[PDB]
Paper text:
FtsZ is an assembling GTPase that plays a key role during bacterial cell division. This widely conserved protein polymerizes in the presence of GTP and metal cations into polar filaments that gather at the center of dividing cells to form a dynamic Z-ring. First, GTP hydrolysis only occurs within the filament, as the complete catalytic site is formed at the interface between adjacent FtsZ monomers. We report a dozen filament structures of the FtsZ core (residues 12 to 316) from the pathogen S. aureus, hereafter SaFtsZ, in complex with various GTP mimetics and metal ions.
Our structural studies identified D46, Q48, R143, N208, D210, and D213, all conserved across species, as key residues for subunit association or GTP hydrolysis. Mutations D46A, R143Q, N208L, D210N, and D213N all suppress SaFtsZ assembly as monitored by light scattering and polymer sedimentation, supporting a prominent role in filament formation. In accordance, the crystal structures of mutants D46A and D210N exhibit altered configurations at Region D. In the D210N mutant, the top T7 loop lacks K+ and moves 2 Å away from the bottom monomer, while the bottom T3 loop is severely rearranged. The relevance of this crosstalk area is highlighted by mutational analysis showing that D46A, N208L, D210N, and D213N, all impair filament formation in solution. In agreement, the structures of mutants D46A and D210N exhibit an altered configuration around this area. First, we identified swinging of D210 in the top T7 loop as a key event to position the catalytic water for attack over the γ-phosphate of GTP.
Numbering used by the authors: 9 to 315
Amino acid sequence: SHMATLKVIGVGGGGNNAVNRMIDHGMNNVEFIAINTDGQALNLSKAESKIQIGEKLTRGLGAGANPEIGKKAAEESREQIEDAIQGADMVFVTSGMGGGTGTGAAPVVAKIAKEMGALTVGVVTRPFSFEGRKRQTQAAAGVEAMKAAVDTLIVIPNDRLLDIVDKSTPMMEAFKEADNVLRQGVQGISDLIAVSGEVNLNFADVKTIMSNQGSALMGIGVSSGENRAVEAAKKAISSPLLETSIVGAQGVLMNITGGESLSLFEAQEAADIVQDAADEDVNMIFGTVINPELQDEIVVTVIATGF
Ligand SMILES: Nc1nc2c(ncn2[C@@H]2O[C@H](COP(=O)(O)OP(=O)(O)O)[C@@H](O)[C@H]2O)c(=O)[nH]1
């Protein structure tokens, strides 16, 4: 076939939560896998594929906050993990850094995926500041292990969630907003992989921009009316949740989707917004897709790397 296989793997409590919320929202052409030391949380997982790691180590009661326990559980379940991953051309590993299962096992899962040739993308959170300095330091070590294990890594500091809520936004909704990064990135990459464009981008272009690239920005912006293209681009590159800014980006995959009214001029304006915002000359892998069922709506998908 010529259709890449995409899998999303949630490791630990936060990653399993992300998996479950993405499933609830509705995702179609992606295989979800849940990996955990916590048997109860895994029994509540909506993922079609489930891997309880560290069963003898932990008896399904969790790894605690020893990254080494989660790491050992993952390494001891390597074969199960590999069998679950087999067939994947692209693998998204999502996890909450700080704990023992995510922080320790997500890099092992990512390394396993990377050594099977899958384009391996990490989307991990850092703990809130109020969780303390030891938690944040452990999260940092986990983030560096992730960087060493993945093709590219998106970090979402939980503190940024305090910048998008008002005083009454339910925690559930804010966590759904954090998960939207991963979900909308997966959906955009999927659509781009699948849909032929007037300037065509395929999976190999995604690899070009994301293979062995370290830190990354992943964003999407939708807009309508006058100045829609510029505004969608600005939305795409200006997410308050992402640690990495677009500045200093050396590579960028950029796709623009619109109706049949999509003008070359406004696509140029969007690409200029992105190319200038980097404050650098950026290797842009650029694409355009005409979705005739859109009308006055323009969607700008951006993936930046090279920091
Ligand atoms: N955004 C978000 N962050 C989470 C969620 N659950 C946990 N976290 C964060 O991830 C860290 C690790 O928690 P968790 O994944 O449950 O620990 P582990 O499963 O033992 O590795 C926590 O300290 C939180 O900062 C979630 O549902 N959403």
